[PDB]
Nucleic acid binder design. Sequence first.
RNA 1: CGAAGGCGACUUUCUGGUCUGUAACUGACGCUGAUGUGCGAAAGCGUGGGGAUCAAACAGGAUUAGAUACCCUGGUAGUCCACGCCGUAAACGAUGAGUGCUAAGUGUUAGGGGGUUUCCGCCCCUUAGUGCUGCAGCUAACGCAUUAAGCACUCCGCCUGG
Lengths: 57, 131, 156, 226, 54, 88, 52
Amino acid sequence: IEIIRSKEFSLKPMDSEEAVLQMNLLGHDFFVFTDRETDGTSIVYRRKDGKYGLIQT
Amino acid sequence: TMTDPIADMLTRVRNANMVRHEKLELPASNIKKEIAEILKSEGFIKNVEYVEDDKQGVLRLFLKYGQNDERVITGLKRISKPGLRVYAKASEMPKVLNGLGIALVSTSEGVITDKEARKRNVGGEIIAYVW
Amino acid sequence: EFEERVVTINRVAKVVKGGRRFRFTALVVVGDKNGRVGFGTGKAQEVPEAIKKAVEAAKKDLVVVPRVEGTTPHTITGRYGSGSVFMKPAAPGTGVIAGGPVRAVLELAGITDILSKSLGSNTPINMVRATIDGLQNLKNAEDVAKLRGKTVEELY
Amino acid sequence: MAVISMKQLLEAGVHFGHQTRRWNPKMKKYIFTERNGIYIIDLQKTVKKVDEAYNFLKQVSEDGGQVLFVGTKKQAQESVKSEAERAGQFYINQRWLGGLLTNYKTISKRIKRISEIEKMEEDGLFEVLPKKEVVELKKEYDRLIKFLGGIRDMKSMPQALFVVDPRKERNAIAEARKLNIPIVGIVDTNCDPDEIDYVIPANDDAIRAVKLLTAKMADAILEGQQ
Amino acid sequence: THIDYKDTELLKRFISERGKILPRRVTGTSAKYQRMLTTAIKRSRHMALLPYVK
Amino acid sequence: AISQERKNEIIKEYRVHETDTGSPEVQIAVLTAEINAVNEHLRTHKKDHHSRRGLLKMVGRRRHLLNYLRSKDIQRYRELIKSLGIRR
Amino acid sequence: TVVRKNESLEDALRRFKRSVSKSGTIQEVRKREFYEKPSVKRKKKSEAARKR
RNA sequence: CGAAGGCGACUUUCUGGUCUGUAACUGACGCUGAUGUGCGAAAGCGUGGGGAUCAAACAGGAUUAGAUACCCUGGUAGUCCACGCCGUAAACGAUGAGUGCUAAGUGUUAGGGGGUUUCCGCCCCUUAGUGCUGCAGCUAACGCAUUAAGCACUCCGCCUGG
């Protein structure tokens, strides 16, 4: 079978700039956070472009 | 079925002093009220408060602390106790901590401090040591 | 300037597969006969260098000993683990009476007249620290009235 | 004027704390409330602390002292180097070397080395060396300025210290209290304020919560000079 | 509510594929539901509404 | 033990005034019902030892209320011994 | 007790090898190979639960 | 769950205790408890039953350098029930009972609520239990830490070199 290793993270409120900083400090391509001003769950990601994209869930 | 009330008072005060608490409350009495009234006159606590409730009205103590985060009451000891009551004449009525600390003593005038019992020339049951 | 005084030197060997070890340690008491005393230990092999290792180690921890003159302010018992000294004030013409290790930590501050007795255990490491911990918890008459809020004459 | 205004102080996000179930009970004074697992650092009271943090650090540099800046949390490493250069003080980016305030009679032995090893190859005595001994003399050279890079020009003890986290940098704070050096630091939830004398309650896992708060304390010494 | 021991269909989703009892670790019920269940699953074993083994 | 209609019956005679359950002689009488009920159970079940210290405890809580009742009025204690049969 | 047909025998075994491992037969008779003491199985079950 | 020993199919009868909530009622009626009086695992003992497995003693076969051990086959008392005894265990949380007081975090139990609901799901605050972490304080050190081995008061048992 295929085993998907889970990496647990606890969701936290921050700026998008902060999420970029923390994501780079781990080199992770995905960082999910709750937006500081919008209150919604946001996923900053690195595209295949190499540019950043922002998803709101 | 706690068996010594004003020793339970006196270790509530010690345990609040250890964790730097500034506010606790007691199930009170007359002798609990008037021991707590005599610590603010000597200057160990800040201010005692009212007695209000329907049954055995509580009172609050307001401990007092040094300006460099030190504590005023450093050590607090009940001396007379059930099973062995200690009584002192006014002649050998002892000075606490070379006259520094006090010794509140139940005499036949109401309870009084260590200083106020020799010049009054009365003795009685010596309740506790406060230092 | 500081006044050096030893307590004891010890001859300690730790067992090795080959030749065993030659560590000579020593504790000293450092004071100034005015109200400031510290202790410390020092581990070396050169014995006069093992002394001065302990002297400079005492220099980092000096405790201020409060004093009504010629004696100690009040009656205390020190505690550190098992060692426990007793400390009664005396008249100014009695002479300081004390045991082996506790005399050196009592002469190096200026008292020279107190009653004392080392209760409890016996090892010189603990009773010199159970005396400093006693002398740590002494209080003058003037600074208690600062905390208590009265004056020096109102306390009496 | 005097303090940080209320708008840009919470725009950095310093009101966030760490998680509930991850709480220190001594920080009850500096917490306004918890909002969805997260606590709310009392914002009015930390303004009443950062001005007190501004008051002494003004007059520390008035005496001409040297304030040490340390930062080792990975999202706040290079936010303290750029503020120490603007301040002209001494920084720490990498880990605490383990004695650079206490066993610094053997650390200044190697600050003497970094004043010497770069002199050793700007002049001669470099062509005669074996080409792999050139490597380890340079492999020593960068690893000195990795850890002791901000202690490059520092030759004496400091007179104040500024920490970003007492949790991860607990080796530094334990050396501070033995030397009686006064201490100021950013604390939050999961931090003990007892060992810090001059307390700044602010967030710690955000960059603007560091950078818009560590810059004014770096700025606090510049107008204490003149 | 209370499990009646005649209501077989809700009671036999809790029996195993041989006749054993599923633990509440794998089913997911609460504590007092599981032991109010087990005094009803075993009165239904006695009156042959459910087997002991299949 | 005993049923509530048995228990509410026995608190009618020894009641001192209406809605005064918990009075000493109204909670000694309900003990003497519970004493006599359980040692009749225990008579035919001689091996039941865990129910015996339930008996021996409520023997003790009846004795501590009889000793209490003499200390404030003796004439009420004499009436309860005659009303329901106890020795001593 | 499961019937497997319309296939080979090397695939009915793959059903049957996991229709026995999800049953109290092999782990049950290995337990009752020898009498254990009535207070050492309470610790044997405790070790088989604290590890989970 | 029970005071401990302990207690595991299911049903009925008989019966003991605890917890929660309400506040109607009694008005210190409480706590501890020498002597005393009762419970108290197993192995035992008595009088009878019953005897399936297991199994001291015992018999035989192997191993080993050697056996009366370990291993294997077989096997009696016992294991089981009823009634009387015996009253001892590393009967151990190696920690007497009672009542207060003193950072927190986290599982779980019967709840109580709850907010919600769920297709019952849950996730939320709540007495009293039961665990795991961990300050102050304590300890000779390990460690203990609102289930103290912290701070107190009462009473009982007990120790003072091997």
